[PDB]
Amino acid sequence: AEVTQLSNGIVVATEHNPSAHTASVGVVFGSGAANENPYNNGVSNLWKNIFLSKENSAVAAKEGLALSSNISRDFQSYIVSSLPGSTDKSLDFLNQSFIQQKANLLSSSNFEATKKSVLKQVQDFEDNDHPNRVLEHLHSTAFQNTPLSLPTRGTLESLENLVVADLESFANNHFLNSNAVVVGTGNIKHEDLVNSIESKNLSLQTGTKPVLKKKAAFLGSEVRLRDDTLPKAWISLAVEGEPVNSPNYFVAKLAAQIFGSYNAFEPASRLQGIKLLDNIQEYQLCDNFNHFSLSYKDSGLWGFSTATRNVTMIDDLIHFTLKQWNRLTISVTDTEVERAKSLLKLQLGQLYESGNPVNDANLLGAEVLIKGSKLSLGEAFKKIDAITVKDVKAWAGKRLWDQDIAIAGTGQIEGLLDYMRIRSDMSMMRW
């Protein structure tokens, strides 16, 4: 009714839904693709993909289980999904996979069939998924020589250099209990799981903490992947944003909300009450964009992302947009702010209140790791609404106005201008 949180060594967390047809259990390791290193990159995405190799996934397929997995930057998750009654059928199959079995998934016929498929995997991504590719490199340059930089799915380089002796090197350090959280989502009780958990003995590497690295940092920089053979142009730009559990966590998400997200095709999109939109549409400066305030444990990235078949006029594209961003400091309409608060809520909803347990897991697992607990929607909303204009005019005033940016891109970006232009559009001339 307010989400449960109790620890007997294994911090056991759950979240009940009485109208759910199914449920899900799993673990979340409080160390992700940003706890790795330059040459072991993709180790966390390698771990995910053995966990779903036909072997272990045929086991749980007779049982009636489905497994879910994802790696982030600050965190890393291993979830299993099934019918709510077969709730022990989950917990046991989890127990087998992470304390019982070890080299049953770590075969020299398994691992050389997973790594020979996480290699094709990260060779369609950087090959044909430019919007994320661009998005990923954006981190690489903004957070260069620092934790967040390492692409979550790992470089094809440090991904052909890795054997099983390396899957473990990360496992036995960062796959602990004092870095994990067990989650219960969907259609199960707190007294169903934490019972079935204290039912099982053993302890893996107790007392052990996972290790640390130099805290992340940010620096104004570019990286440009020109490719004049690609029909469009993809660009992503940002400033040093705000972390998870930062005073302006919501203030910053409200700002993103204002300019928001465009799709020049859906007539619905064309009518949004966004000021910037007035400009961009005249000549069709782009095909779409969208904003964001990506928050991570140590640092953040407020900016936006755009694709465009309009090559001669990208220079305006970036211009109109970064000028709008100036208003946030000097001239944002209050009535804009309300449409923000309003729309944030709708978005922040379909995020948190989707009828899909697997999401409510990672969400829970990550948050109850970093701050300890989760924060309720009513808590969030109570904050969103407190937000004045002055909220947004002092946040932009430090974060946005005349601060270093972080551009990245690919496709026909000859037209995308230089760094002393772009960066300079962070401000406006004053008397």
Partner: protein
């Protein structure tokens, strides 16, 4: 000369023509800059600029 020698009708036309002409240079500097414009500047490498332009 306007007469027997470089005399008075001379320095007076030399003043007037001194006024006129600099506007002719400026007129001409404009076509000069127009030519410059349609090809853009060269480089201390005598190769093509079109791969690494800045504004």
């Amino acid at each position: 000369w306007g007469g027997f020698s470089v005399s008075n009708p001379t320095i007076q036309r030399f003043f007037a023509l001194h006024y006129l002409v600099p506007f002719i240079i400026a007129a001409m500097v404009i076509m000069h800059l127009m030519a410059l414009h349609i090809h853009g500047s060269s480089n201390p490498l005598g190769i093509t600029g079109n791969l690494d332009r800045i504004p």
